[PDB]
Amino acid sequence: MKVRPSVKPICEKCKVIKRKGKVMVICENPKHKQRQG
Amino acid sequence: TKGILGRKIGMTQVFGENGELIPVTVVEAKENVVLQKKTVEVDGYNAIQVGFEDKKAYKKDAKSNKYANKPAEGHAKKADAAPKRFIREFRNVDVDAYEVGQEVSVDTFVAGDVIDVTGVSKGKGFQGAIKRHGQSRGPMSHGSHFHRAPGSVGMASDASRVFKGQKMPGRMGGNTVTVQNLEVVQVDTENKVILVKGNVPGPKKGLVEIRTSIK
Amino acid sequence: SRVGKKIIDIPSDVTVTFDGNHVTVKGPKGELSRTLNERMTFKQEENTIEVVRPSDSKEDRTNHGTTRALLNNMVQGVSQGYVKVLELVGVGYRAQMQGKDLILNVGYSHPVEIKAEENITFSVEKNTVVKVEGISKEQVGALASNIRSVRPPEPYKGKGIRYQGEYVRRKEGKT
Amino acid sequence: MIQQETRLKVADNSGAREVLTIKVLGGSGRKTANIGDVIVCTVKNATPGGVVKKGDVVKAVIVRTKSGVRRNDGSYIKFDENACVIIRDDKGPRGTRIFGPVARELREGNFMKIVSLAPEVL
RNA sequence: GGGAUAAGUGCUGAAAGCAUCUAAGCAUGAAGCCCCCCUCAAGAUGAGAUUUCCCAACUUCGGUUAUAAGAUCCCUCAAAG
RNA sequence: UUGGCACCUCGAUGUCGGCUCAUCGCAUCCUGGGGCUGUAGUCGGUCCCAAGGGUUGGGCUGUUCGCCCAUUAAAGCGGUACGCGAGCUGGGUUCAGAACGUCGUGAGACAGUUCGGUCCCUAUCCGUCGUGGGCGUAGGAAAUUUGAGAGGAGCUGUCCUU
RNA sequence: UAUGUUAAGUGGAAAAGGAUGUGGCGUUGCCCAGACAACUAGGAUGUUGGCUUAGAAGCAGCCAUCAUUUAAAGAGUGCGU
Ligand SMILES: CC[C@H]1OC(=O)[C@H](C)[C@@H](OC(=O)NCCCOCCC#Cc2ccc3c(=O)c(C(=O)O)cn(C)c3c2)[C@H](C)[C@@H](O[C@@H]2O[C@H](C)C[C@H](N(C)C)[C@H]2O)[C@](C)(OC)C[C@@H](C)C(=O)[C@H](C)[C@H]2NC(=O)O[C@@]21C
Ligand SMILES: [Mg+2]
């Protein structure tokens, strides 16, 4: 889980979602899971 | 589950089954009587009050706690008992297994229970920071003038005050202490004595409140 | 909301009792009872039920389609049932029953026992394929997750309780 | 009660005739030790020859002390001198004999070669 | 050993007929939070509760003696100082 | 932290280390929970949640620091007048003596060394640790009490088994 | 009082940057011939042809990237070495 003030898609399969207030990216590559931003 | 009022007699030793030295305290529980049965709807919490020892009866012109006063005679006569010296109550007990007026006997305890003995500590009187609080004291040489007093009591201008709880000199002792997870080695029904492995708080001739471990 | 408005529901040999808010669906396999959204209203024609939003507001819309699919799930489930299949892969990894409870042997130096609940039933197959079944989709989902959390799949040999047909990303760590 | 900067006699033919200790293994802040406890130490008097030589740092086990030990029955065993034996990091001695009595409590610590190569277990 | 949680993990689920931990709801999850365990605690001026003991007789009207029940003075003491 | 400014203090706010006693933050050293990994488990690295507790003994210097020797699960970083001298020391530094090197024609000088060099105070108030008396709790009393609150604990190793 | 805005206690401390948070005003390319979803409907051909490179035929790199079996098709939009 990366927590970086900059959450943005890393791959094309990358979806930005807003969960519980935080802009996160959930992707099928667990490496591309991101949290804050 | 079980509870008995007793007093501490001393310590001795017993030898165990495999030869082990067992350290023990002799406690004397005699004529423990239930005097009330507190109930939830009558008093708000269910429990029972036990009176221990035996005072003498009321006399006119008494000058000591040896004899009962009129107020206490009445409380004990409602349980058809003699005036007693020490009165405590127990909550862990099932109030319905006791009756106002029964004797609580030493045999309530079997060998190998787990009990908590709650007494009062021995008085050490006014003491200082090294005995009362375990503080390391200062150097005794090398030109020191700080032998046993406590050190700094605070900081400086920030908190221009001493904080609550600063460990300073004063009276030591006279505190209720509960040692936990002791056990009984033997119960003697004729001399009325419950022997408890280990050591318990208090002066000799004191008072201990033995009941069943809450853990 | 397309899900909500467009897709009309289809009561099939079941009894959708829309008692004000609290609905009560029954059929072949049992009864399910939920309280749906207040502001929403429902129009039950013959063998069809339809959900309508009060406004075109985001709230009314996000809620609209949500509890239009929560009715379908109830009626589709009290009639045809909902089941989840879990497989167990691994030398010595087993699956066995014990009075409607499920003992699992997944290499944990201790047997793990999942106790079952109301309206829910477990079953095994060849000591590997567990199957959770019931009428609520959110009980079959909750339990099947609880029984996969015992040992979820691992990335190196896939060993663990996997959902039947679930891509386990397999790494190739070597010695 | 053995603490650091305590000189002990060696009861073995390792070469070391007398040694002193630095630490007592077994815990942060551990300060003392008794029979059956291991200590780090540096010899101060060696025999001419021997496998262990002067100024080395070595593991070692206490075999007899003047403070002595309580046993579970209320029996106490005390001695007239501190003593120690060097070990090879396997609870085994460095020398081939062992001089003087030894306390029975070393049996438990699995210092069995120390208990087997001993004049008197006690 | 309970109860509520943190990062996290989910379940059902739409806005956005797909998805999706989220918005409704409902789960799980830490030496952390609350309880649990030890001690002090009704000056808790909100001053709480239970049992018992004491209960008259002058007033000229109590702004009333002295006495109960209970203590203390004083004295022998220490398990307390 | 090294500074810049000169705003309170020169009818005096003792300045450095150490000792005694701590207390608080968390950007966490260990312990607990996790996402990961170029993680097969032990391994390590990274990031997140976490401050409840814990977070050694020595050799060398007046030293803080740092290095070294043994350990530990870890040997955390900071604030607190670089916490704390009306609680302690006084080794360093900063009076008068002396001496060496250097500068000065000289008296003398150097933040260059070196040996020596008086640490006062009976606690009024607030504060804090204990311990009494008075009064109030719609009568006067003896005993047993619930608990609104408050405080204390809160750490963790190795071995065996599977 | 009227009409609107926020959902963060924003109001009631920062910034470069990051974001399917939400409201307004335009501009716009597409759409009942039916754009946009997963619309679970076909997905490959001589053919990696040529340099074919560790052999490697959507990956170590020049791409020469020909028409369509076809309602819709690319010497493969593409996840891969
Ligand atoms: C016994 C009772 C008397 O107390 C005292 O002597 C105590 C001991 C004294 O403590 C101290 O020395 N400092 C604490 C120790 C500091 O070590 C560091 C190393 C040094 C030095 C040094 C430097 C220069 C000179 C100097 O140049 C020179 C010369 O000759 O020129 C003479 N030397 C000696 C110097 C030595 C008091 C307390 C002292 O005050 C303090 O001095 C400082 C000026 C300021 C202090 N603060 C403001 C920071 C202050 O607190 C006084 C001056 O005493 C001399 C107190 C005055 C009032 C008195 O006179 C009283 C009446 C004393 N007289 C007497 O008889 O009773 C006394 C109470
Ligand atoms: Mg002044």
Side-chain angles (χ1 to χ4, degrees), chain A, chain B, chain C residues 1-4 9 11 14-16 18 20 22-30 32-44 48 51-58 61-86 88-93 95-99 101-112 114 116 118-124 127-132 134-137 139-163 165-171 173-175, chain D:
Chain A
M1 170 93 48
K2 314 206 210 293
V3 352
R4 22 177 56 171
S6 177
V7 152
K8 35 145 96 134
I10 297 185
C11 33
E12 82 262 82
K13 281 174 271 323
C14 282
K15 341 181 351 153
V16 161
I17 56 185
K18 190 164 153 168
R19 274 169 194 181
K20 288 262 199 213
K22 288 102 145 73
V23 186
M24 305 156 70
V25 162
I26 53 143
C27 181
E28 75 189 20
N29 186 19
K31 274 166 118 163
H32 298 167
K33 297 178 19 199
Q34 279 149 261
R35 182 184 112 213
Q36 81 193 2
Chain B
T1 295
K2 318 165 184 197
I4 196 145
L5 281 180
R7 49 169 53 197
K8 173 187 201 166
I9 303 297
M11 291 177 71
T12 7
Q13 52 186 50
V14 290
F15 290 101
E17 243 57 67
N18 322 112
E20 55 259 336
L21 227 220
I22 311 193
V24 297
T25 298
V26 31
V27 167
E28 197 201 352
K30 54 174 226 223
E31 61 262 56
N32 307 73
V33 169
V34 170
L35 283 72
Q36 309 186 216
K37 292 189 292 185
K38 300 297 188 72
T39 36
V40 152
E41 69 275 16
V42 162
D43 184 1
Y45 63 101
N46 64 34
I48 62 112
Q49 198 183 78
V50 181
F52 166 74
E53 238 219 40
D54 249 14
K55 267 174 109 183
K56 310 223 144 95
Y58 173 82
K59 194 180 49 161
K60 218 94 73 203
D61 299 313
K63 293 179 179 179
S64 64
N65 207 33
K66 197 206 253 153
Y67 310 97
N69 54 19
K70 283 247 285 185
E73 256 212 352
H75 180 64
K77 190 70 226 153
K78 267 206 28 173
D80 313 318
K84 295 270 163 323
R85 202 174 280 266
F86 304 84
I87 297 169
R88 294 287 185 286
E89 28 191 59
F90 294 77
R91 301 259 286 285
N92 64 7
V93 296
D94 169 53
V95 64
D96 314 294
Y98 292 82
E99 244 71 51
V100 174
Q102 101 185 5
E103 307 187 305
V104 188
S105 253
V106 273
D107 31 85
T108 37
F109 288 99
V110 313
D113 297 344
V114 185
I115 59 174
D116 286 344
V117 56
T118 300
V120 296
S121 55
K122 296 177 99 174
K124 302 302 170 192
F126 201 131
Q127 297 283 341
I130 147 165
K131 196 195 257 199
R132 188 175 200 236
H133 297 303
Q135 298 183 171
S136 128
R137 95 289 200 221
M140 301 302 293
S141 72
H142 286 270
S144 174
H145 300 73
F146 171 77
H147 292 179
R148 305 189 68 123
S152 313
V153 289
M155 287 96 99
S157 262
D158 272 340
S160 284
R161 65 194 184 110
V162 175
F163 285 164
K164 260 158 163 83
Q166 216 73 72
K167 287 168 352 122
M168 293 203 0
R171 216 162 278 189
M172 206 209 323
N175 303 304
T176 302
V177 179
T178 301
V179 176
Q180 294 180 356
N181 313 318
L182 301 176
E183 64 215 26
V184 311
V185 317
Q186 90 195 33
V187 152
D188 257 350
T189 61
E190 64 284 35
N191 287 107
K192 281 126 201 352
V193 152
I194 313 158
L195 251 51
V196 301
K197 177 184 171 55
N199 11 40
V200 314
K204 263 155 11 200
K205 273 179 308 194
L207 172 93
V208 298
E209 310 182 18
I210 301 166
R211 73 200 75 193
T212 294
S213 272
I214 205 161
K215 285 164 137 191
Chain C
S1 179
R2 269 112 157 196
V3 167
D9 289 339
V14 292
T15 316
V16 199
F18 301 74
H22 169 305
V23 197
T24 334
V25 193
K26 293 179 179 179
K29 323 158 163 263
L32 280 177
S33 314
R34 261 178 100 115
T35 310
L36 297 190
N37 193 231
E38 218 108 64
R39 320 191 40 230
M40 297 219 283
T41 120
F42 326 98
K43 183 178 179 180
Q44 60 267 96
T48 251
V51 197
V52 246
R53 19 198 185 97
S55 36
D56 224 284
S57 102
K58 204 163 272 104
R61 267 170 335 146
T62 180
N63 252 303
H64 182 252
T66 302
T67 130
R68 165 289 182 211
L70 284 172
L71 213 29
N72 187 85
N73 272 347
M74 278 165 110
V75 294
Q76 210 249 45
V78 117
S79 73
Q80 98 123 313
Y82 277 116
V83 141
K84 232 145 170 211
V85 184
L86 303 135
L88 264 84
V89 182
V91 317
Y93 283 172
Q96 44 264 125
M97 322 262 340
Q98 215 233 284
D101 296 323
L102 192 97
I103 265 69
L104 261 191
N105 295 132
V106 275
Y108 258 158
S109 286
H110 84 260
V112 210
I114 283 321
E118 280 62 2
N119 312 108
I120 271 257
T121 153
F122 302 141
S123 135
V124 296
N127 286 323
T128 278
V129 165
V130 174
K131 274 198 73 273
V132 191
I135 48 183
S136 158
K137 206 185 161 164
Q139 219 84 72
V140 165
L143 258 301
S145 77
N146 300 337
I147 320 162
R148 158 185 182 281
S149 79
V150 168
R151 183 176 279 261
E154 293 177 350
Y156 302 99
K157 271 146 98 143
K159 323 182 46 213
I161 319 146
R162 71 166 69 186
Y163 285 122
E166 175 218 340
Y167 178 58
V168 174
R169 249 273 317 271
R170 305 265 335 241
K171 288 227 190 50
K174 58 124 50 239
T175 291
Chain D
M1 293 180 24
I2 301 299
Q3 33 150 321
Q4 74 178 69
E5 307 279 342
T6 287
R7 265 157 193 270
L8 280 96
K9 321 203 183 146
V10 189
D12 204 5
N13 48 297
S14 30
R17 319 201 344 281
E18 178 278 281
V19 60
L20 84 89
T21 174
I22 318 160
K23 233 84 203 162
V24 298
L25 304 184
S28 152
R30 169 90 164 278
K31 288 246 190 173
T32 278
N34 232 309
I35 297 89
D37 291 330
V38 169
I39 44 152
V40 187
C41 64
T42 71
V43 296
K44 295 293 187 184
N45 285 277
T47 278
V51 47
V52 175
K53 309 166 325 283
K54 162 142 154 73
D56 300 339
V57 177
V58 308
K59 299 292 180 68
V61 68
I62 314 183
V63 295
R64 20 187 215 277
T65 63
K66 214 150 346 179
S67 226
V69 259
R70 186 201 238 248
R71 312 201 137 131
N72 219 17
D73 42 79
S75 162
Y76 293 71
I77 193 166
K78 279 179 172 58
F79 294 87
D80 271 9
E81 52 116 356
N82 308 265
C84 82
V85 164
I86 310 299
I87 49 177
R88 292 183 291 113
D89 209 356
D90 88 6
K91 316 270 280 273
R94 282 247 221 153
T96 73
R97 308 205 252 159
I98 255 133
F99 304 130
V102 117
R104 213 205 298 123
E105 278 89 0
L106 285 141
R107 202 109 64 179
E108 331 197 286
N110 215 33
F111 297 104
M112 287 310 328
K113 204 134 298 173
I114 262 53
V115 178
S116 70
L117 254 178
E120 217 146 2
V121 197
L122 262 150

